[PDB]
Structures are given as structure tokens and as C-alpha cells.
């Protein structure tokens, strides 16, 4: 499996861990069957885009943590969407609200890039502690000191 690759306009580089691929069929939130390569394992990545930078920890169909820095709200949102799709989480699969048309991961990404409101509302939030250098981000992509999208923090 490749150590560096591109997804959603971000260069990903695996800095720790490894995964194996297992083909699985998942049911989307539009009741469509999708055949995807699910990655199994613990991994850490960097993400570098033109307008945002992040560190992503993940496990099998599970986002662990995304620490993201970006130029503005929109640029941060772009990184979050890519990370949420990349995670392969079921809540992301179940947030699909269209029939998808081609690589299935790319179709998922394009769908959420078009409108991420259901993705962000269904993802979940959590309370956060005041940690120096970080802040929370709400489903509407605005900041909060007290709560954040689950597993997501913004570097500031
Ligand atoms: O699976 C693919 O066809 C490609 C598509 C474009 C980039 C990504 C994500 C989709 C994937 N390629 C690659 N994906 C991965 C990978 N590691 N861990 C993952 N967890 C979820 C995932 F979803 C993809 C990966 N490691 C090396 C790759 F080279």
C-alpha cells in the first residue's frame, strides 16, 4: 500500500501504522449498496493542502483525531470533509442523501463536497477542555471553546 497519495486536493502521507484492505459492501443513507475497500488498522497521516494542514489519526472505520489548521472557515471545512470521508465511518456512509454515480470513495467525497450539512450534523459533537493551542468547531463551521465536532480540533 502506497505511503503518499492525494485525496480531495490534499497530499496524504502515512507517518505511523499500516492497514490492510478488505472489500465490503455498505448501505448508504440513500439505501444504495456501495462496494468499498475498507482499510483495517491503526494509522496516522499528515494532510497538506493549498489552504489547510492537518494531522489525522484513524483506526478501522473510525476517526480518532483530526487536528486542523486553515486559512479560513471554508478551508478548514474542506479538510474536515475529506478526513470524515477518508475515515470510512458508518455515520458518514449513513449521511449520504443522494444516489451515487468510478471509485466509490471519490463519489462519496464529491457528494459531501457539494453539501456537508447532513454529514456534519450526524457526525456528533463532544464537550472539550480548554487546551492551549486548540479550539473547537461546531457543525456550522464556527468556533467554540466548549464543544466540538467529535474528534476534531482546530489549531490556533
Ligand atoms: O482506495 C482508493 O482507491 C484510494 C482513493 C484515493 C486516495 C485513497 C482514498 C480513496 C485511496 N488510496 C490509498 N488509501 C490508503 C489508505 N490507508 N488507510 C486508509 N483508510 C481509509 C481509506 F479510505 C484509504 C486508506 N493508503 C494508500 C492509498 F494509496
From TrEMBL:
The lineage of its organism: Viruses, Riboviria, Orthornavirae, Negarnaviricota, Polyploviricotina. Plays an essential role in transcription initiation and cap-stealing mechanism, in which cellular capped pre-mRNAs are used to generate primers for viral transcription. Recognizes and binds the 7-methylguanosine-containing cap of the target pre-RNA which is subsequently cleaved after 10-13 nucleotides by the viral protein PA. Plays a role in the initiation of the viral genome replication and modulates the activity of the ribonucleoprotein (RNP) complex. One of its GO terms (molecular function) is RNA binding. Signal peptide: none annotated. The chain holds residues 319 to 482 of 759 of the full protein. GO terms for cellular component: host cell mitochondrion; host cell nucleus; virion component. This is Polymerase basic protein 2. Influenza RNA polymerase is composed of three subunits: PB1, PB2 and PA. It comes from the Viruses.
